PDB file of C-alpha atoms in Angstrom:
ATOM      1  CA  UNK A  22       0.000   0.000   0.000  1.00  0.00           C
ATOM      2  CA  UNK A  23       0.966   3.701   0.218  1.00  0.00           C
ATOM      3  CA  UNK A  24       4.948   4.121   1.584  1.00  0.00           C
ATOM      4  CA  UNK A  25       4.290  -0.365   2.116  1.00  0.00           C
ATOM      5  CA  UNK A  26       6.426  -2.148  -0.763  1.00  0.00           C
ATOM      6  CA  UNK A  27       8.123  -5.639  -0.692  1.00  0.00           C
ATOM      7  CA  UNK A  28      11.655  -6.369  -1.400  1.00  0.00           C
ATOM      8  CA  UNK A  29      12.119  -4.966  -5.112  1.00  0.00           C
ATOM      9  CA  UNK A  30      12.836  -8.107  -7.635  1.00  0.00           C
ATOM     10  CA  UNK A  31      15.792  -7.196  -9.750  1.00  0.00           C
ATOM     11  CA  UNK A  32      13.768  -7.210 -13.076  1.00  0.00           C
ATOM     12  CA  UNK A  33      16.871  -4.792 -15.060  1.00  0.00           C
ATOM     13  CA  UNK A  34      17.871  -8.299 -17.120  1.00  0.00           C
ATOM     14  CA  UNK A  35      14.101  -9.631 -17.949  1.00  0.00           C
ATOM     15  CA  UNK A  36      14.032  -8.196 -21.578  1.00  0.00           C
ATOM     16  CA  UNK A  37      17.547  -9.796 -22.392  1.00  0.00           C
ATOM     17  CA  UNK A  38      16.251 -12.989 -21.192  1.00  0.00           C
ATOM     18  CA  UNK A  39      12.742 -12.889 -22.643  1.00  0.00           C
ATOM     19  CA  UNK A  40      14.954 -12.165 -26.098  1.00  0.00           C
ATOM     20  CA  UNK A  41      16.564 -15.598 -25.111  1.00  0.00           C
ATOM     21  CA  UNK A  42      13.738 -17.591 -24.549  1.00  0.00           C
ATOM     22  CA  UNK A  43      12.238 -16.161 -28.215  1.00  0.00           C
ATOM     23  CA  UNK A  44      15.120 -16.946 -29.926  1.00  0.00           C
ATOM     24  CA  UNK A  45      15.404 -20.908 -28.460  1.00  0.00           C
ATOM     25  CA  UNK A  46      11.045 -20.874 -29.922  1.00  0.00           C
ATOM     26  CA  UNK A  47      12.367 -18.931 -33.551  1.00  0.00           C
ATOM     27  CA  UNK A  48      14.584 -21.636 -33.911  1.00  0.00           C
ATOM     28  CA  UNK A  49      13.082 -25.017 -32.811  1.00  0.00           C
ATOM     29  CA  UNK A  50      12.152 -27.420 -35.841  1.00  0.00           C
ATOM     30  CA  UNK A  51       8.504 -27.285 -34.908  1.00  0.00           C
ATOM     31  CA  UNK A  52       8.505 -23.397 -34.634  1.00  0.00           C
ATOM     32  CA  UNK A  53       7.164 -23.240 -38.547  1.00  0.00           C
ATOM     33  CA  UNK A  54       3.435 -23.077 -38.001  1.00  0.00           C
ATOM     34  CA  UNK A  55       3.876 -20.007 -35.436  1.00  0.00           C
ATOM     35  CA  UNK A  56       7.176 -17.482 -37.572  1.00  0.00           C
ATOM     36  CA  UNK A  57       5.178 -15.335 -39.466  1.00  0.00           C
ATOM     37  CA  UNK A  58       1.258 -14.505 -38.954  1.00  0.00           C
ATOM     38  CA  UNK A  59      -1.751 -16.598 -40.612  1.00  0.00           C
ATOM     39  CA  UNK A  60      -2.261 -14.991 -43.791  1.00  0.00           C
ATOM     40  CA  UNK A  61      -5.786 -14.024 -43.389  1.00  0.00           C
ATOM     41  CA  UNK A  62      -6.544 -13.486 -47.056  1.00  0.00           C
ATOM     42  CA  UNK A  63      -5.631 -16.990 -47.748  1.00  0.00           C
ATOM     43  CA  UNK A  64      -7.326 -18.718 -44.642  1.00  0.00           C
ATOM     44  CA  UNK A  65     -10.929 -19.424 -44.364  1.00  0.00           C
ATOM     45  CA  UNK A  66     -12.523 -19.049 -40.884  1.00  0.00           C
ATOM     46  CA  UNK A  67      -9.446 -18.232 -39.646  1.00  0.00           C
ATOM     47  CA  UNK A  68      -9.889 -13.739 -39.403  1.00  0.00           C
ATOM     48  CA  UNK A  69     -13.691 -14.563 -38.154  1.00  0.00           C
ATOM     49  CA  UNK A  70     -13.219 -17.251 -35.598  1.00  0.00           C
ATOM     50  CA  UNK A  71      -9.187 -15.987 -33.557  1.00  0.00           C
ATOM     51  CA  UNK A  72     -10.086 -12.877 -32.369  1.00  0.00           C
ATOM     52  CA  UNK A  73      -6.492 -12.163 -31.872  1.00  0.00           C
ATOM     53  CA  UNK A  74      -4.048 -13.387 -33.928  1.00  0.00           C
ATOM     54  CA  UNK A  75      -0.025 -13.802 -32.570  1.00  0.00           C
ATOM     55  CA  UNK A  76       3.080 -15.137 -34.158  1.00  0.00           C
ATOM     56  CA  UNK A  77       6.573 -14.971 -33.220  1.00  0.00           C
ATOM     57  CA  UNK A  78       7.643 -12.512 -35.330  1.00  0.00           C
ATOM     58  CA  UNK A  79       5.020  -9.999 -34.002  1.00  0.00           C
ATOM     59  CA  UNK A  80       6.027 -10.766 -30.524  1.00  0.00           C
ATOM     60  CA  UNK A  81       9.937  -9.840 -31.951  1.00  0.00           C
ATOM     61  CA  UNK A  82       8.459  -6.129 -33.359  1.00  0.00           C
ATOM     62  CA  UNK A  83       6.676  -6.100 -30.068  1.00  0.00           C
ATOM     63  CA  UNK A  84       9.825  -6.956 -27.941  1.00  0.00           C
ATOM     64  CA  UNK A  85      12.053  -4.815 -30.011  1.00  0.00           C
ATOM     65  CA  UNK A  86      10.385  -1.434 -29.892  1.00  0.00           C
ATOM     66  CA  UNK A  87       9.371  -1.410 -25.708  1.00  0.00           C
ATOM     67  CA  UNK A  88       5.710  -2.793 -26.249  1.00  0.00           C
ATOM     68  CA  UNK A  89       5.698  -4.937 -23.600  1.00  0.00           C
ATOM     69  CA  UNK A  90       5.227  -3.637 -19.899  1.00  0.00           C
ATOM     70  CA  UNK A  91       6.772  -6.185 -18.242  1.00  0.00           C
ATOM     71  CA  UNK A  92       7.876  -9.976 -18.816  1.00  0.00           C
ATOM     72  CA  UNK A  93       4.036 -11.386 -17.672  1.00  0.00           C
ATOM     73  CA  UNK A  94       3.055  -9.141 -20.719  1.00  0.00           C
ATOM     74  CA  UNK A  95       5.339 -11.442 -22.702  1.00  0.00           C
ATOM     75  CA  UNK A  96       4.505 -15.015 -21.332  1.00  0.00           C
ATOM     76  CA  UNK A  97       0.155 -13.719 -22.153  1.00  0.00           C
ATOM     77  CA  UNK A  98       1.483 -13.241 -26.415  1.00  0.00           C
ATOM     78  CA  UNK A  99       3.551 -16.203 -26.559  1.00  0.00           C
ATOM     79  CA  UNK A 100       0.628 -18.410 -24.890  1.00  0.00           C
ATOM     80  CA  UNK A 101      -1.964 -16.645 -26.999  1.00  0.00           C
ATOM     81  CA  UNK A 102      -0.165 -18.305 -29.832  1.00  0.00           C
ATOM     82  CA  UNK A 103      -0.411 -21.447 -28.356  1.00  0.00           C
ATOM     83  CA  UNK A 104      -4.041 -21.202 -27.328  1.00  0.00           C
ATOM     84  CA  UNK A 105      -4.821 -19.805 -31.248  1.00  0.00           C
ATOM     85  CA  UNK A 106      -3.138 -23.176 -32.520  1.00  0.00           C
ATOM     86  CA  UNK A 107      -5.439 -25.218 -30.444  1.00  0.00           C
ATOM     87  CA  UNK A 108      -8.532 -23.324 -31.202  1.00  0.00           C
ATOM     88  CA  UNK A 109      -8.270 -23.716 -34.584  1.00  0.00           C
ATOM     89  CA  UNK A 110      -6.147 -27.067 -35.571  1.00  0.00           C
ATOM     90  CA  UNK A 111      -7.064 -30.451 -34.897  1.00  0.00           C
ATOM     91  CA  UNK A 112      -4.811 -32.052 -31.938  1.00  0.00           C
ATOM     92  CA  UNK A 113      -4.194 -35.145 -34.206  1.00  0.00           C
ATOM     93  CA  UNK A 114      -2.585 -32.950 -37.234  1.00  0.00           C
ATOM     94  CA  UNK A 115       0.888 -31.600 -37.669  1.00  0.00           C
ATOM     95  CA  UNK A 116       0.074 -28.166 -36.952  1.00  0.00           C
ATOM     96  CA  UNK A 117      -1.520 -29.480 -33.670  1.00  0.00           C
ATOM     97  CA  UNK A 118       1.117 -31.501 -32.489  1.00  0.00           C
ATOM     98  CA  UNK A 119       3.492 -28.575 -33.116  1.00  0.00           C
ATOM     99  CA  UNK A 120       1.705 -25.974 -30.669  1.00  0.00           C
ATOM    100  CA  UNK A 121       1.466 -28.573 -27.938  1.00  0.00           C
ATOM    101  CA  UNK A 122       5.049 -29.663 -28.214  1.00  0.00           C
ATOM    102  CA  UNK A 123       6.175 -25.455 -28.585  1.00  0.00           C
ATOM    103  CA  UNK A 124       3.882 -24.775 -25.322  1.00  0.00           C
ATOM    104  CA  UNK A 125       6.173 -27.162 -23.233  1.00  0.00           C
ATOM    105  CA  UNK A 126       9.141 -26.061 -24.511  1.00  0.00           C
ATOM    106  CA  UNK A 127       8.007 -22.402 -23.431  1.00  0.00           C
ATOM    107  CA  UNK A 128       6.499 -23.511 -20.337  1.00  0.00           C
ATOM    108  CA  UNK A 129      10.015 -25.157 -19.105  1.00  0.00           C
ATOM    109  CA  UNK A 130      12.189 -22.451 -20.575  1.00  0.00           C
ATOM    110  CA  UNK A 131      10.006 -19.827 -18.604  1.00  0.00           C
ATOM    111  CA  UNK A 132       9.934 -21.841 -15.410  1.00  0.00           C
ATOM    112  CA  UNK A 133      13.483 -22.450 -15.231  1.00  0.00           C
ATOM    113  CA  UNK A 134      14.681 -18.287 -15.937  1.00  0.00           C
ATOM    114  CA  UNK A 135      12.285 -16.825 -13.723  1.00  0.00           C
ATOM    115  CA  UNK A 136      10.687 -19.384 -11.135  1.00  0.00           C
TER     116      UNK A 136
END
């Protein structure tokens, strides 16, 4: 509360090491479905239905030019990406595999920098 604030967390090296964990994603082999955004033109359903679309190379703009707040800011785009993949793919399809398997590699990454 007012003048009442615990111990501050040394957050002066989170944006180094959320460029880090995005790199490790950007270069994984089952990164492909997620580097560049849905091409809306070209996908039915896909601008009606995800209300929000996110890639990896919008969360690298984002990243790059101080658009995100803090590193919780960060961890909400990259699992919107996940949570887009399983919305609209099939879990038994390529596509679907690749989101879970990308969402666990995240998850540990994330876990093991900051927790």
């Amino acid at each position: 509360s007012m003048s009442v604030k615990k111990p501050k967390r040394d957050d002066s090296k989170d944006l180094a090491l959320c460029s880090m964990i995005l790199t490790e994603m950007e270069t994984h082999e089952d990164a492909w479905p997620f580097l560049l955004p849905v091409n809306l033109k070209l996908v039915p359903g896909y601008k009606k239905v995800i209300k929000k679309p996110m890639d990896f190379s919008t969360i690298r703009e984002k990243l790059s030019s101080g658009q995100y707040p803090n590193l919780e800011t960060f961890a909400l785009d990259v699992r919107l990406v996940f949570d887009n993949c399983e919305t609209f793919n099939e879990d038994d399809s390529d596509i679907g595999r690749a989101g879970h398997n990308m969402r666990k590699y995240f998850e540990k990454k994330w876990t093991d920098t900051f927790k």
